Amino acid sequence: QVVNFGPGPAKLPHSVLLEIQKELLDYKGVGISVLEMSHRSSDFAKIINNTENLVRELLAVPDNYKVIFLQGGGCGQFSAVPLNLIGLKAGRCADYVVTGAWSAKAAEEAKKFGTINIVHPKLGSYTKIPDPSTWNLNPDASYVYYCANETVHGVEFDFIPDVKGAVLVCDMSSNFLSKPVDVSKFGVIFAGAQKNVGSAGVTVVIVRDDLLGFALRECPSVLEYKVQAGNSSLYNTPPCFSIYVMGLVLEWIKNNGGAAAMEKLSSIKSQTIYEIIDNSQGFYVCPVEPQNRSKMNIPFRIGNAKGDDALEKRFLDKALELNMLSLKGHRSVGGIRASLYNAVTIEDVQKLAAFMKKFLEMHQL
Amino acid sequence: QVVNFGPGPAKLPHSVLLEIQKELLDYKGVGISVLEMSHRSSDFAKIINNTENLVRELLAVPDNYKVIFLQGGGCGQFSAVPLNLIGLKAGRCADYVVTGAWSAKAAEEAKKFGTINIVHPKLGSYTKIPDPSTWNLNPDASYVYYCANETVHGVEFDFIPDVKGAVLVCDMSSNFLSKPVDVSKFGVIFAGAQKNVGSAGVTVVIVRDDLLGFALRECPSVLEYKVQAGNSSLYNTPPCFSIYVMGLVLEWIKNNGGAAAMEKLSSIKSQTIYEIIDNSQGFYVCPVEPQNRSKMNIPFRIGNAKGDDALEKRFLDKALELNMLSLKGHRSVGGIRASLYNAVTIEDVQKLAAFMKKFLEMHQL
Amino acid sequence: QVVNFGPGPAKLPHSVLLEIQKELLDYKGVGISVLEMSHRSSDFAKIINNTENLVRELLAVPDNYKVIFLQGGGCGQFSAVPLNLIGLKAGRCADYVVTGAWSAKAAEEAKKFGTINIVHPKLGSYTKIPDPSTWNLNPDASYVYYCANETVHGVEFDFIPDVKGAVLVCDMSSNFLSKPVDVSKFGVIFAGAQKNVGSAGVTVVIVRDDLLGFALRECPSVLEYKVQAGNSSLYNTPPCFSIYVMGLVLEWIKNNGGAAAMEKLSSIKSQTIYEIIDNSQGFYVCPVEPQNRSKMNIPFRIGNAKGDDALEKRFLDKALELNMLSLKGHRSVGGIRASLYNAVTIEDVQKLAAFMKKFLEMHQL
Amino acid sequence: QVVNFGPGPAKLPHSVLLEIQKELLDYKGVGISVLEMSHRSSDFAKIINNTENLVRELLAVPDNYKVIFLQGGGCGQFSAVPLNLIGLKAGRCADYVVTGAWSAKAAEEAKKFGTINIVHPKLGSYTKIPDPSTWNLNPDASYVYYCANETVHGVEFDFIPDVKGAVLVCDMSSNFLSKPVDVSKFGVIFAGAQKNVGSAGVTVVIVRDDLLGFALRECPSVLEYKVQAGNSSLYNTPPCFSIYVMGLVLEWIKNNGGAAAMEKLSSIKSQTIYEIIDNSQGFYVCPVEPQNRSKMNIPFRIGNAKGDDALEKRFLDKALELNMLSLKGHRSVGGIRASLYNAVTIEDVQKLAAFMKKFLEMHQL
């Protein structure tokens, strides 16, 4: 009974994988696979339209927003957001809120297309969100960028930051549809499906329809929002099977209570793991400030704040023999990371909860 | 009993889809799905390395070449080829060989990144290939581009042109691994997997190692050849499932005799359909000249050289009744188009051949 | 599911058996079975003429050759060839090239009508074709006989030998129409139709029209080439149903690309098996020198050169459990033998190759 | 609705053609066709042994008699009988009785293998049997040959002739198993299956076991009784499907009363037509003497003895409108010939009887 705590690609609901297996050779009586299905056929037109309607219903996406499915992953949008939006104002300036490895990597990628100004002082360690009241915002910047949830460091926004009245861009790859979102506050929301809403190969991008037509000339057509929105994400061959998988995962989300229930499940799973760390008497330490602790990714150290390597490997190896996968923290941080996306059930978190209390009972003073 | 003549995405071998189904929940005893498999796991490392080895083995790729798997499809490389290569020489110039709709679209996209020079007069109709002795090639061009197989107009190269020593870029989306290729004579080879080596979502790129480090600054990192070769295509989350699907089709290709056998089958499949056209007494009309006729995509008309709309609808309606799918010609050309890719079997073409004979016998005057 | 690797009689195309089944009671509306059809009727003249034209068309038989259909099988020609041709020169001598079991049988049978001389030294094993330079040819011999393909030992000519201008008689029974043939180089070609062109009961004999009229006095009139050629194979009641079946198989070969396509298909098929043997690391042994390996019959042993009986039985027992018939080698040789004639499809050879690979993976020490 | 009066190949029972059609693709559930079956398999062993058992049962063939199945038809035995038996005595003589065209052909063919003495003077008209007591028999002759039923002239033996202890050979091709036979009185019986007991392609031969081993050197192996009886008709590939068809016809004759009932059913059929001729008052002319009239073939003329070409054409034209096929007389006699073999039912003959009665009533002067 494997329990997959993958960081991305992640666990998919067992119910969904069972339907993908059944329909793999004959999708709902059409006589062919989705892997063989044409993106121009009427069969796939209903698949991609259903996926889009499930994005607009679950997130309550206003009618003045375009929902498109592109390739290239989240790292692809690190280039797509500037190429499409850095030309909103003549200065070609952009403000970036760096709270972890991904918002940092995004700001570096944005330097290829203009002058990038980070809005706050560089944090010594990614352990908190700089107070937005201290944000040095440029009134001539084309947009403001920030990552809602840092998968490696465990820093998550529990608010939508006030950014004057400027265009707001948000990376929700690791917390997409984990909680309801007031979409109207955002200019562009993008998320890789391989984390919380499907399989790797497709990236959902929600754009306000007044931001189309500002893309730079060097923006590749397959990544230009205006081109891709005008063709309903069918400018070229899209990731057909990936969109079909995401729709089934989206269907699973709607059946289990929508975005409102996902947030409640994400509270229970994160709290039970955090309360084991807060009561660990120092044995488990999470360097993130309590007001910004991510509910999707929980990276922690064992024993001491610097990380007892001998104790961590024993934790990983004994978790492996218990069929708990991908608990090893990121390479650039080490330590332990526990990913608690939507597919991760509460029974799966309890196995991790009982295993962490028992491992502390056997190693702590 | 469905016979899928899809043009892209296209038919997959039935033995492959059977394995994808029984392993979909537990890949080779790992305990999870490939859809859940992390791209940083030991398990996916075997899959992506096995796919590369098969690309190198089946095509006999020399050692001085990188094999990377990118996202964005074929049209993604229409932008990635200039972004990475057009700065190879100081002129930012490039030569393109337009033989059909796909090379034409490729030249239009490359204009976003430099000065493009189409090396020949505009063909009144894409029915032939201009002789390469008559090519107005620029000695200062960064590369010479051409599409090996035109999927819409059925025009194919049965030779590697003499570009007078220039770097040669080739689009082999619709004939990749349908015949042996001398990889040494090319600078860059790319192909969308959704046509002949698997499913959509992944694009195989074969690059000569001395052509990295010339990418423009606006080139997105996920599409930069140097960045992805220096990461073995794992710069960000790659299309794991599409790479795993492509790996099986490559295994299936090697089991049926490799690229040398695919050329033998493509000749039998294509000739059995061209024979029916050449001996049709004008009932079936293929406008492509014989020296350039594609062995992958055969477009033709019925009734006359311009196409009897009544006969072509009766043809496509009865073809659907016989469970023969995606025979309808491309929206910009109409008529009929039969796609005979690798997975399309001889018993598939024979069913089509018998239907074309019975239909001509019943409707010719 | 049944996969028929029969040596002869062999498998017939499933489309041929399906048509024979539906016309068995009312052949093309005439109201009777072919089994009831008179050999003097207008309907059967159209049948036997169409069968002769297809033989002339697919093999490109010159106009100065007679195409006659006889009874008695190939072993019947072992007597009809001497009876008709051994009196061509007054000496009544014939030179024979023994390359396997069926050449020796034919050479021994010919000793009942004249003095027979084997042109090459007795080979210790039927594993290689003696170099035509080694042949000790009699300039007074009436003809020179050789077997194109040895069905029991797997030794095949991929050339027409030089016989110093003598009349060349060939036994192509087990490779008839598996490849194009320069008929102008031969004097007499015969082939039992039960191996690669039809069912048992009829033999096709192609004789140059000037070799008629040299038959001995003891030649039965039903086997005399001059008598049957003058009666269009209708001197007596011919095997009507066998000739009807043979015509349908000829039509199936023509619809699948004629002799040229059969050579391409027979190359892919035999390569699939030989590649397993050549890379088996001594687990499969094929004694025939690779330059003389048959593309129709692949005899081999399992374990060692002499063959491990315990392993070969387990192979055949498991193969029979998988509905793969007639894999047992010939009685005089034993071991394994795979017959891959024209009707044996690529998927059929793919089931066998996948089985041999798994069997080698389960028992290789 | 078709009434098949064929002379050979002839009508087969509707019951037999049906089971052949049902089992054509999967004989008794073994997976393959009889056309694909190997003559060495245990499946064909049951077929040929049952066909041998039925012949021995329906004719009461003693144990000292061999039953073999050859190729070459009836005319094949015109040469195989002398080749096997003309050397019983050193003189190489053979006594032949020429009562019609088929015994005349056999006598001329036998001259190729020895000196042939016709036992009676030329008849002038094949209308009677020369008295066996006036037969000029050679006491040193190797055998005595005679045709029991002359298919062209309608002259049948209703007795076994006394040849004074000579080895007796009989050509029962056109009345085989139409009546019981005292096999003990014969040395060799043979019959082409295509006239009374199946379809063309196979010949049954019944030989006393002490008449083997007298074949000349020039006899082909496939036609030597000693060779073929020693291998149980499996010296080479036998007409597998033609032997299988014979087994069903014999099984049909057994289910309908054996030879004893066929003789009495043949009496009803022939008496119906012969009486119409006798009472025709010269409108229908049968020149054969009543004591020697055949019960299988009834040749006659219309109008007068020499034949009215006008009436004989309208008879064959109106018979063709009524679907009464093959009623035209043989090429060497012309006129009309009705063949009343076993599968020809009483209901069939009544259609002919009513037609002849109506034609006479409409054109008799």
Ligand SMILES: Cc1ncc(COP(=O)(O)O)c(/C=N/[C@@H](COP(=O)(O)O)C(=O)O)c1O
């Ligand atoms: C009594 C008897 N003996 C031998 C034969 C020859 O049969 P085959 O040698 O298998 O053709 C035959 C064949 N008789 C047929 C022959 O027709 P054909 O003259 O061959 O068109 C008939 O009477 O019309 C036969 O009737």
Ligand SMILES: Cc1ncc(COP(=O)(O)O)c(CN)c1O
């Ligand atoms: C939050 C977040 N943002 C961006 C990315 C970039 O990944 P990709 O572009 O390959 O989907 C990731 C992948 N770990 C991520 O977790």
